[PDB]
Design a protein around this ligand. Structure first.
Ligand SMILES: CC(C)[C@H](N)C(=O)O
Ligand SMILES: [Zn+2]
Length: 918
């Protein structure tokens, strides 16, 4: 056998990734060697790119959605680095808020204990955030991501707390921070007000009742009827105690039935079909003539004013709306328009308090009962006034961290106003809603559809309630002047508190006296001031990160506005919106130039993962099973703008993609491993097939790059994979295998092939480096030729090379046109496939071909079809309009296995000379 006389063509680069063992070593080296700092220090940086990290909550281990997020950020950041830019990417953690505090409260409950000291309670929350920040940081690094993880930002840093407070101060000084009294979301489980981002709408079952309020005797006399009762529909019997009015649609017809029920005429047919009221209408009245009549509450016998409500709907209900100003925002405004009582006797824990006794609103037995528990007994107490009881299902607001349904309570809270004109930085006058809508139009959204998701929210959102009644967060640290009952926004007071926060953190707001928290020129008047003890919405904390990270560090951690932020599409309701709003107050523009969103990680069926459903796949399990480079390729090679399903089949497909990339890289490294590096300095004469491959490589490289610039990594990876599978493996490597293994190492044509393979390996490395960074690091570690060719110590020295310059190509060389010869190749292979079926031949090398069209390079035909002979032979096998196939009129060469030998078992002329070489 002559196998030992072939070129060895091997590389130390292994076919097996052994990713579970090798990736941790790579990532630990990048940490020890400070690779990100090295990236930022790269001397030839040209241009800047800032990605501003949206901070995860510092609670719990990372979930799969965190990995998706940081991997996508890493690909985007690494692309910009390898394009040559100085990168800014400081990851951060969201350390305050119910996401941390609720965990402490649940632990205290489970341990059967309490912690009432505010400093010690906050210390427990702060230690909890410190613990999981370190856990999450190290779990991020296990993904192979690069950023300033050894100097991340933290909302609990004292300087950061001061930054958040200084952001709040800017909002106050521009006149947008005001107190309001009105019903808002109230979570009784954590005894706190909430705003929209802290509410999760879920389906919930509820009573649904139709209740008769009888008109008082004097109102019946005014209306000239013997019996009349307005029927209301409500899903909240627990607010009936607080009824003050029944609101009707203005200028609308109301039908009185024979049994004496008064409902909107437009709803009578539906209501009679339900059995709420009887079918016979006796009289019709205009609601304008019913206004200021009075009815009687059947629950507590109190008066109820018949009023006219703006936008009373006739789609559902009865057209008569039970109005409780203490527990509904539109009810509140109507009560004020009619100067009615605001009845609100539900405490911070959602229980009826002594106000139901003092005001005669509800029987004393209900004192202390939770409003939701009391509803069944309230419904029974309604007696004959209850015309119909149903149970319905509806989407209902729940607290984001306690998961309990919220209620609504009239309360005094602090708000950022949306429709209050304020002075713009350029001197003009606009409302916050107007500025934010203008700002959104200047932001690039990827996908574009995200723009209108955020725009619709800004169009419809109410004033933003900022004040919370928990302890773990930044306080709304203003004083109330008792002489004025107004807050003190004097700059000397606010800057004094801000400076204290920067040096000592916000604990002092609880510990110091009012006098110790005031400037020395105010301390004799300290008796007139009281502290506001509410803390800020944690969404204000995170909406302020642009100011605390980008602006307060003066560009050292990135520019404001950032170039890119990248988060789940659920951040339209969260971080995108709060950052937009705060940036529009401070700067009158969004603090980001571009928003890229991704979907959720879901299970095999497309459902969200939760321990309740038992479908959770841990990040640790996924990484140990597949390796991080496979998980990273799974992300990049899929439609990450939508939900990504975790299933064995999809990860097996990704592993097959990774194997094809890795096997291709291994073949390349193996087949230029023996090349004399003196080749790199001299020009080469490339064949037409060589040139076709170089020109194809340039064409697909432009396509991969354009797709990756759009963040369409699927499109670019499909282009790359098709090139690797078809032109590279299917055509070029197949055609080149004979020369690579059987030609002399000194053969000039073989050396030119190796140069093409080096150029191809180089482009594969550049384009895969952002995604498969560990693997390309390993490629360079095993190929001295690649490192010298690219002038690269390691993966962080990669640049986009000019193949033309490195291979000394001539500028006006006319591109190859292989359309005719590739059409012949495809037709030959189909004919060859048929002959292999019949058993006529086993291989293309056994064949000779005579091509009808003599306008084709015959060496190229032989190369591309891998026949052993182009021309006429003696034993005809088949004929087409395009060619005739014969058995090759030679023996198989024992060394190269081509049918080119004149004598049996004797090396062909090429092999003979290679074997004799001195
Ligand atoms: C600010 C935002 C990213 C928030 N901490 C979250 O994890 O949803
Ligand atoms: Zn041979």
């Amino acid at each position: 056998e002559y196998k030992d006389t072939l070129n060895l063509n091997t590389t130390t680069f292994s076919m097996k990734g052994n990713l579970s063992v090798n990736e941790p070593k790579t990532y630990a080296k990048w940490q020890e060697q400070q690779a990100f700092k090295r990236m930022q220090a790269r001397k030839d940086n040209h241009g800047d790119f800032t990605l501003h990290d949206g901070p995860p909550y510092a609670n719990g281990h990372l979930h799969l959605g965190h990995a998706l997020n940081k991997i996508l950020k890493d690909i985007v950041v690494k692309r910009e680095y390898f394009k040559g830019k100085k990168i800014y990417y400081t990851p951060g953690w969201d350390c305050h808020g119910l996401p941390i505090e609720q965990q402490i409260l649940e632990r205290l409950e489970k341990e059967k204990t309490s912690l009432e000291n505010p400093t010690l309670f906050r210390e427990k929350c702060r230690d909890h955030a410190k613990k999981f920040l370190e856990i999450q940081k190290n779990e991020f690094l296990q993904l192979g991501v690069l950023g300033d993880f050894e100097d991340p930002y933290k909302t609990m840093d004292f300087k950061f707390e001061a930054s958040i407070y200084r952001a709040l101060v800017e909002v106050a000084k521009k006149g947008l921070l005001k107190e309001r009294h009105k019903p808002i979301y109230w979570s009784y489980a954590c005894e706190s007000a909430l705003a929209e981002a802290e509410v999760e709408y879920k389906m919930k079952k509820s009573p649904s009742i139709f209740v008769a309020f009888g008109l008082k005797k004097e109102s019946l006399e005014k209306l000239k009827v013997k019996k009349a009762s307005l029927v209301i529909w409500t899903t909240t019997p627990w607010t009936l105690y607080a009824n003050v009015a029944i609101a009707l649609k203005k200028d609308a017809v109301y039908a009185l039935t024979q049994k004496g029920y008064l409902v909107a005429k437009a709803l009578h047919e539906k209501l009679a079909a339900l059995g709420v009221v009887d079918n016979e209408i006796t009289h019709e009245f205009n609601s304008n003539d019913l206004e200021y009549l009075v009815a009687t509450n059947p629950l507590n016998q109190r008066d109820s004013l018949v009023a006219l409500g703006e936008h009373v709907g006739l789609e559902d209900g009865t057209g008569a709306v039970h109005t409780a100003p203490g527990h509904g925002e539109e009810d509140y405004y109507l009560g004020l328009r009619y100067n009615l009582e605001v009845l609100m006797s539900v405490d911070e824990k959602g229980c009826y308090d002594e106000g139901i006794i003092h005001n005669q609103l509800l029987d004393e037995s209900y004192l202390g009962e939770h409003v939701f528990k009391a509803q069944k007994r309230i419904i029974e107490q309604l007696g004959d006034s209850l015309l119909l009881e149903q149970e319905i299902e509806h989407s209902y607001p729940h607290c984001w961290r306690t998961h309990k349904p919220v209620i609504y309570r009239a309360t005094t809270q602090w708000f950022i106003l949306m429709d209050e004109p304020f002075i713009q930085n350029d001197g003009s006058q606009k409302t916050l809603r107007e500025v934010a809508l203008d700002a959104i139009e200047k932001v690039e959204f990827v996908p574009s559809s995200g723009k209108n998701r955020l725009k619709t929210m800004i169009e419809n959102r109410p004033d933003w309630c900022l004040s919370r009644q928990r302890k773990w967060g930044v306080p709304l640290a203003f004083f109330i002047d008792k002489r004025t009952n107004k807050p003190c926004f004097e700059s000397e007071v606010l800057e004094h508190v801000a400076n204290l926060f920067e040096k000592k953190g916000c604990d002092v707001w609880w510990e110091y006296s009012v006098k110790d928290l005031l400037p020395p020129s105010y301390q004799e008047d300290a008796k007139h001031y009281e502290k506001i003890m509410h803390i800020l919405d944690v969404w204000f904390d995170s909406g302020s990160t642009f100011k605390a990270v980008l602006e307060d560090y003066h560009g050292e951690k990135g520019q404001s506005p950032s170039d890119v932020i990248l988060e789940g599409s659920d951040q339209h309701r969260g971080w995108f919106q709060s950052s937009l709003l705060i940036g529009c107050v401070l700067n009158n523009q969004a603090p980001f130039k571009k928003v890229i969103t991704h979907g959720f990680i879901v299970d095999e069926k497309g459902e969200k993962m939760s321990k309740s459903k038992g479908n959770v796949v841990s990040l640790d399990k996924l990484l140990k099973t597949h390796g991080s480079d496979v998980v990273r390729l799974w992300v990049a090679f899929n439609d990450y703008q939508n939900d990504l399903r975790v299933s064995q089949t999809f990860f097996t497909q990704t592993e097959q993609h990774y194997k094809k990339f890795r096997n291709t890289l291994k073949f390349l490294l193996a087949n230029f491993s023996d090349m004399d590096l003196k080749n790199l300095e001299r020009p080469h004469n490339f064949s037409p097939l060589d040139h076709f491959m170089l020109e194809t490589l340039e064409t697909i490289s432009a396509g991969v790059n354009s797709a990756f610039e759009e963040h369409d990594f699927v499109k670019g990876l499909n282009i790359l994979m098709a090139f690797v599978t078809n032109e590279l493996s299917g055509i070029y490597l197949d055609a080149c295998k004979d020369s690579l293994y059987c030609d002399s190492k000194n053969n000039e044509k073989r050396q030119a092939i190796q140069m093409v393979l080096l150029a191809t390996a180089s482009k594969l490395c550049y384009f895969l480096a952002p995604i498969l960074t560990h693997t390309i690091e390993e490629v360079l570690e095993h190929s001295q030729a690649l490192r010298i060719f690219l002038q690269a110590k390691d993966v962080f020295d990669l640049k986009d090379i000019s193949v033309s310059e490195k291979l000394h190509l001539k500028e006006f060389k006319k591109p190859e046109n292989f359309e005719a010869v590739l059409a012949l190749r495809s037709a030959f292979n189909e004919e060859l496939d048929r002959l292999k079926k019949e058993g006529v031949i086993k291989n293309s090398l056994e064949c000779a071909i005579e091509v009808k069209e003599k306008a084709l390079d015959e060496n190229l035909v032989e190369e591309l079809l891998m026949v052993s002979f182009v021309g006429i032979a003696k034993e005809k096998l088949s004929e087409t309009p395009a060619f005739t196939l014969f058995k090759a009129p030679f023996y198989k060469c024992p060394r190269c296995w081509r049918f080119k030998s004149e004598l049996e078992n004797t090396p062909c002329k090429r092999c003979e000379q290679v074997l004799k070489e001195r």
